[PDB]
Paper text:
The [name] system allows for Pseudomonas spp. to adapt through post‐transcriptional regulation by altering the ribosomal subunit RpsF. [name] belongs to the ATP‐dependent carboxylate‐amine ligase superfamily of enzymes 13 , 24 which includes other members which can add amino acids to the C‐terminus of their target proteins. Each individual [name] unit has a classical ATP‐grasp fold with an elongated shape of approximately 60 x 35 x 30 Å. 25 The glutamate binding domain of each [name] subunit is linked to the ATP‐binding central domain by a flexible linker region, which is likely to allow the protein a range of motion to enable it to act like a classical “clam shaped” enzyme.
RimKPA was crystalized in the absence of its substrates; ATP, cdG, and glutamate whereas RimKPS was crystalized with both ATP and cdG present in the cryoprotectant. ADP and glutamate, of presumed cellular origin, were resolved in the RimKPA structure whereas ADP alone was resolved in the RimKPS structure. RimKPA has a slightly more closed tertiary structure in the center of the protein, leading to a more occluded active site that contains the predicted glutamate binding pocket. This occlusion is due to several factors, including the addition of a small section of β‐sheet in the core of the protein as well as the divergence of H2. In this study, we were able to resolve a peptide fitting the profile of poly‐α‐glutamate chains of either three or five amino acids long, in the active sites of seven out of eight of RimKPA monomer subunits. RimKPA chain A was examined in more detail as it was the most complete monomeric unit with a fully resolved structure as well as both ADP and glutamate bound. Interactions between side chains and residues less than 3 Å away were examined, confirming that the second resolved glutamate residue (E2) interacts with S68, E3 interacts with S7, R8 and R64, E4 interacts with S14 and finally E5 interacts with N262 and R189. 10 Intriguingly, a closer examination of the RimKPA structure highlighted a set of residues that were unresolved in several chains, and that correspond to the lower substrate binding loop. However, we observed significant differences between the ATPase activity of RimKPA and the other two Pseudomonas [name] homologs, with RimKPA showing a significantly reduced V max compared with both RimKPS and RimKPF. Conversely, the addition of increasing concentrations of RimBPA led to a reduction in RimKPA ATPase activity, suggesting that there are important, intrinsic differences between the responses of these two proteins to their corresponding binding partners.
Residue numbers in the entry:
A (entry chain P), B (entry chain K), C (entry chain M): 11 to 15
D (entry chain A): 1 to 292
E (entry chain D): 1 to 293
F (entry chain F): 1 to 205, 219 to 290
G (entry chain C): 1 to 212, 218 to 289
The structure:
Amino acid sequence: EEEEE
Amino acid sequence: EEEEE
Amino acid sequence: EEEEE
Amino acid sequence: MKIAVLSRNPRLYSTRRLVEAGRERGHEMVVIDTLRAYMNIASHKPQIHYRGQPLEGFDAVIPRIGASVTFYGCAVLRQFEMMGVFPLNESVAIARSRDKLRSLQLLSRKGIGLPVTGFAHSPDDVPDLIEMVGGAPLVIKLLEGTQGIGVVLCETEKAAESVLEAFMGLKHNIMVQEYIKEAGGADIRCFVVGDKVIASMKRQAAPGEFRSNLHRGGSASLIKITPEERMTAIRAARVMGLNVAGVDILRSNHGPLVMEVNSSPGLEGIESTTGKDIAGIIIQYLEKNGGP
Amino acid sequence: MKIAVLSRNPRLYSTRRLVEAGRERGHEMVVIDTLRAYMNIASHKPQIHYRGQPLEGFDAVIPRIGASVTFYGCAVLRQFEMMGVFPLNESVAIARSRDKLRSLQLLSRKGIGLPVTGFAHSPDDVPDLIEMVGGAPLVIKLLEGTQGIGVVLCETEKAAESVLEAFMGLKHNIMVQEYIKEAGGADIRCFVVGDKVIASMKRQAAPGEFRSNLHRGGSASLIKITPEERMTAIRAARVMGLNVAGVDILRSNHGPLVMEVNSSPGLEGIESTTGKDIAGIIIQYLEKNGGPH
Amino acid sequence: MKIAVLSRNPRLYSTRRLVEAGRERGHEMVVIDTLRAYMNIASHKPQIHYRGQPLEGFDAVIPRIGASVTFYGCAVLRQFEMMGVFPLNESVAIARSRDKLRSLQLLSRKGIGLPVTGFAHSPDDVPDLIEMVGGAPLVIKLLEGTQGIGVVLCETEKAAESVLEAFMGLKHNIMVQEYIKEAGGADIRCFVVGDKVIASMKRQASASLIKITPEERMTAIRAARVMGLNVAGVDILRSNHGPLVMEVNSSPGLEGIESTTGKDIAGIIIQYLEKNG
Amino acid sequence: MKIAVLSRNPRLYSTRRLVEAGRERGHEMVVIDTLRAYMNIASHKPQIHYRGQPLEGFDAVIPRIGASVTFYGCAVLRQFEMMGVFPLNESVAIARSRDKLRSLQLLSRKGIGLPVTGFAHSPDDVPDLIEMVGGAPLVIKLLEGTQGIGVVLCETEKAAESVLEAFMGLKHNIMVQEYIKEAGGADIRCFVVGDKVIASMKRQAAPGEFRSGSASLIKITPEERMTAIRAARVMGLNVAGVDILRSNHGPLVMEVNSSPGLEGIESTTGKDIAGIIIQYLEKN
């Protein structure tokens, strides 16, 4: 979710 | 995790 | 203790 | 019956299994994401809305309310209760069990076996607090409202002094407990439904690690519980006002000590170890108490 | 009597006044900083320690537990209760009143007059939520556990849509209430002790400002409350299980509506407006219910 | 090469693919959970420990540092840099790009196309702020440190006034932007590696292929170079005043762009490390 | 000159004194509440608005940006810089100094004396971490972004183990430092202005408490003087409070503060520090 913004 | 404590 | 430390 | 399951994730083992077991037995099972329910609390027109539509015709509700959303989850459950829907566990009981300080004081008052336990926030005399609970070694638990943040073994007085000094001014609530070394990193999970322990298991922590959660990478096995453990688990649930509860017990030299009373216990560990249809037994409980 | 006052600051108007009033009436008044009390929770010889020593010979306790420390404050109060010390307000009642969602649902269930009120966290359909509670104008409150974080008046549908979308990114609990325009920015504070309103005042918000706090720049005056308002204030306190409560009431077109039930009401506003010894009346309540009898 | 991937989850599409692509091309790929690395900074020789052992013989590192762990992730990356390990993106550039206020001020100063934009925290004159950015409708973005918390359309002056009044005293940093209605809910994601857009897609509120203009291509490349990033996702809105940069991401996802274009993006990133480490 | 002071409270000792000193010396001193400034970002005619009006004709700005508002304060300061206003300290230097992890790594890289220091978040091997930094006794600091949250002296290995296990559940950044016992609870605060230490004081912690408590005059060594000046220059700061421990391995930098207090240093030395800061702005 976060390391792929 | 949280609902399966 | 923020802009006076 | 039409049964709501208040769960934030319908893919979770316990939620899936409750839905599966309900459908095997001819019930309409609907998973409601607790946080996506919104409500009118007007007495002349009470509503629970969900994705633009009202929720109608529910006979019972199974609350699987995570600790981080206790206040809102209890508001959604309370609303179901006010609308005549039968709760597996009552809102007041779930709220009570999630307040760890209140839970321990109630279990203590009712003569349930507990580790020697102290509470603090900003104590001026840390050595006095450490002496009160029988000195080191002791376990320090860090609480923020309705959530456990950490659990720490302090082997010496100076280690207890350092943890307490560190947490003073971090605005956490602090539990100090005698270390039950004689348990050897094992605890007993008793699955309570009504006035019965329907299943139990031993959880063993990996060698070194004292914290024995299956979540924290510890192994599980069958166990024959003592009549005293059986009675303690049942009484702890009844004292909390819960119909369905996981009760965690440490085998101490002064008999069984209750560590946890959980209003939303996991099914994965207990079902894979015992082979029992726990989900089914829970559905059966709703049939006998909430439905035709 | 020996009376504990659970207060984090003994210089606060209300704590000072309770200590003053207690001493005028021959009581030993001891201010206990709630967070500096620590305890062994054994049933069989129950004790509270404070600055290295046990607390002994307390007859009663006045909880002034701030909302940020409700859980720990209620644990210290519960311990006093288990030791046979008489609480001005019970721990279960203070905890209940600090859970705003639970308070509203209980008052509603017991047929106490309330503004039309909605709860949400992460609703998929904001327009549906706004419609449910009767549309704009409405007041939107942000709650984090036992604490109010923010309050906005949203005069239009689009303003309500924007505030709710904004607050949904904070992952807090959201209260939506109809704005009671017919009150004309006035509310009644009723000070309840036992089964009586012992004092009341009208708070008028400054023109523009919708919040009628004296903190938010609003004026206060004396008021004669109706028998229905009097009964509503008393019932709200009894329903919450509180012996002492501040109850805030709006005069609406559907009768008196309860806005707030406070377990730890301020004395400054009500005392300076009425001139009444409210602190004294509270001490009197403890004498009649918690003391030698 | 021996290549570290700083990622908290090795099961994530982008981390899996970078590991896969590296191994196809004969490299030793090691996923390091950023938060499980601990370090001695002061002493005779800079080292990073991980699960009881030092990390040795790394040639390059691919930082996939999530926004919530920017400070610690940049400290671990900075340590790799001090030990002579080649970073895909430099620590200073990742830190800069995660500070949204600083990023916009830098892109603005360097003449990159931006929506008309205002900053506020506790403004005394909300109507003045709303007028400054060209009035309603406008978008309000809420920032807490290095993280975007929400994005909200305010269709009217009164809706903008209410959101700003609500957030005043909530201790968030506030961005106010002109609403680019003419984009019709579409944006362009340009995947930049070195001085090239190697892939792009249209996102509609679904994803599709797109032919970007020479101006959009140049804007994406310049935005990355200005931020000091070798690898960046640049998000662009097609406005009536040309392409406007919305986002420069130091750790762009591969799933959306790879499934839409069919291109080996992971491979091209590994190729970049081969040519420059 | 017209000088802006970015301060959230004009009644604070340091802000009052800077305003006082500026006015004694014929300057127009304006206190700007950092959070009440709002801005349009545009390279052509860059402006800052405040209470409905633009801020115009400012020659210099003194940033007193509190650690909790570093990002927004640096955005307001950066805007002043882009408009050609002279900053007492640069935005990039203030941001750098507020990132404690980055500050230590930079000072270390430039050979400035530091306590042996480790960083951790969720280490799997706590005993290894404790061994790496030379074992107990050690000081354990909790960091959340640009703010220090907590400080603990751990006298024994078991106390360090317990504190680290406790703090690992808070999901904050963890600093571990060797305890400099030989300092006997004293530190030196060196007030640096333009590559000179203009004033210094010894701070002594109350008996028991290891965290600095009383203050006194001190004659600093040439090595301490050079260390304080170099630490400020390495951070890129013209005005800095540098805290130094007298260790058995020479002077160790504990803290480089971009917004040092004036009350402690002025009441102990009797020096017009506010004045010297104003003088720096006049000369530059």
